[PDB]
RNA sequence: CCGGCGAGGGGAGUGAAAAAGAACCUGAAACCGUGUACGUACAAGCAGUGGGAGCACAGUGUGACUGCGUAC
RNA sequence: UGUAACGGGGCUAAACCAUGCACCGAAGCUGCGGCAGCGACGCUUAUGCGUUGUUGGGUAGGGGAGCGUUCUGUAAGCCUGUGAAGGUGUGCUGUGAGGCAUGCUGGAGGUAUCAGAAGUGCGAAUGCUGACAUAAGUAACGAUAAAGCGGGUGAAAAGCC
């Protein structure tokens, strides 16, 4: 329930081989306002798929 | 015959045992006292 | 054209114009030195006890000390430790003759 | 050390090393182990060892020509300027003057000069006869110093 | 005369961490681990100055044995045949010949095969 | 010309900030900006402030020309920890480390 | 003057082919391990793969003396608690007769990354024909 | 702006050294049977 | 100037010096990063040591493979 | 627990017995170079140094030599703003503790020598103090009475109004 030996710099970074965040690299431009947005999300100004939805 | 030229006679000054100061001195880790008994304690040693 | 001679308790195989490092010979720097005891001269044709008249003649280059070795003696749990350094004297000779 | 004799924690039970005083010398801010006391660093010198030394220093000062005997060394005014001249003609810079009389005119005139010391032939010592480049003695003073060293 | 010991304990520690370059992990950084890394590394260095002279004699003997057997004799009969012929070349040079001048080794084997039998 | 902007004593832990820093290491500074905009971390809001400041530190002082900037160096150091106390069960107390960090963005044409 | 060491680029391993019909197994298998390792060469150096590529042919016709055909058992364990499976020599000749030469040679090669690479140069075939005509293997007569 | 506050420890342990170490009252480990 | 009329930072300036900027002389070590060279994804164990390629630099660095080797 | 009673592979000799020869094999011996202790040497003419003999595994322990640190004298001396101590590298050389030179930081003090005095050398004492790791970005976020929306403000609102 507790370690017998302090793990190393090696094993601490080996565990964080999968802690690395994944960037999006998939921003989508809107066809009526040219805003980049998340795919299938509305824009910051409230356009979505060419239509003004939220305003 | 200046103050930085005067020496003692040879052998007039022996150094003095410094105990418990490492392996090379031959007096480390017990202080010349051996292992655990009455005589190796601080103040130990029987009377005359 | 190489030959085998034997100088500092060890045997060396040298060619012409080669420096070989030997044990510390006590001959001054710049003096020609003969090694009359040549074990085996070889070429396209080879000559092997000792040879009869082949002499390696060299020329003394330098008298240095070697890279320092650390001698560490250790006895675990027994309160014993001993360091010592060592630089070994050598003699470099450039080989100026294979007979 | 200012502190209480309270044992800091209990002897058993807590997993900390056993302690019994906050003023133990292993601890920070408590206790020098073999702490100093004011002591006397004087040594005994035998009189025949003290006199044998001074007879052996004065014998060596005439060997390395650092004893110069004068017959009078006195200066008229109690002025450091005159004595500063006193040894230029004498060709002295680091000197110890040893006189037999109680000359207070000469005594003040070397009180500011660092390398010049005036004595009274009875307080000359080991380290003063060595740490000066020339020792200059008046002839009345070398009569007394010859006497006390027999 | 109080003596602070930060300057010469730093230097004594720094001297040992400098001998521990290239060691893994805390054996290069931590003094307690790096001290007994360096003391063990000097212990091995003493021992393998003995083992170096054995490991190379092992390596020469294995190469003379191979190069004798290409010339049709074993190492034992080649070394016995050289001693009966009073040839005094050591095994360092006998192995040096065996890779660099093979025709100077087939002559040595012949001078051993002759004076043996 | 390398242009530095720093954010010292950033109140997020350095391991949390270093996750977001590896997203924008070497990227072009326009692409680095909207990686940090659609990253759902608190460190993403912190690092984007330094990058947007290094963008203005370049074009106000050293020169101009936003569009050829790149996030050349990006590295997170550990600032001084603020030490706090969480009380635990049975009288016990623990030390909480409010771990600060030092975000440094070096932008460069 | 340092002793020569062979290099793992300038070494040139030659291809040999061996007909293992009627040969005593570990008398065969120890000359294979000698030449897989490279101890028959004056250029031998114990940290470099200096050996040869040996093609063993007719592995199923390898011979053992005595009663070893029915009494030499091959023990392997599968990692599970039952585990200890075993096959005699004649069962091993029926199932995978290539394995008999390969097991015997593998115990005679050194243990480690290098001896595992010396095992890669032992091409063992149960039949009489290999595929390595392009490497032009010389006949190595045992 | 009045910053760089300290790490005010608990007012229980007067040796801040062990303040975050052990509670120093009772050590209950109860399963010991040696005979 | 960027920022939230922030915090922090980048300039400009002072000064011999701001890597003396107040969390301020010097600033070690543990510990934590970034950049670069080399090694590393079929290889078993006190992590070194002896041998040793290859590579990268201008001797240094790394260290495949390998012998011996169970800390204090 | 798994072959598990050649170390293994394997061996019908690679096993036993007898004989013989060769070889391998240690830090033993020899060679080569170095160093030290002890003697015998009058070898020298304080006697160093030489010549020969032989010895140098070591715990407890005894004996003999040193190294370095701080402080006093030598020191109103020498070094030092044309860069001290310290820190950090590198190189050189001592049998060792170590020593020296120097590139960069540092920005004002340091001390040949020979003596003198010791708070004189740390890896350990479940040592003491500070700092920082580790587990681990894990457990948890303290009553399972419960929240959802729309406005507002704001740099930002699940929590504020």
Curated annotation (Swiss-Prot), chain H:
Beta/gamma crystallin 'Greek key' domain segment(s): 1-24
UniProt signal peptide: none
Disulfide bridges in this chain: 5-9
Family: Belongs to the beta/gamma-crystallin family.
Main function: Crystallins are the dominant structural components of the vertebrate eye lens.
Domain remarks: Has a two-domain beta-structure, folded into four very similar Greek key motifs.
Protein name, as recorded: Gamma-crystallin B
Taxonomic classification: Eukaryota, Metazoa, Chordata, Craniata, Vertebrata
Range within the parent protein: 15 to 38 of 175
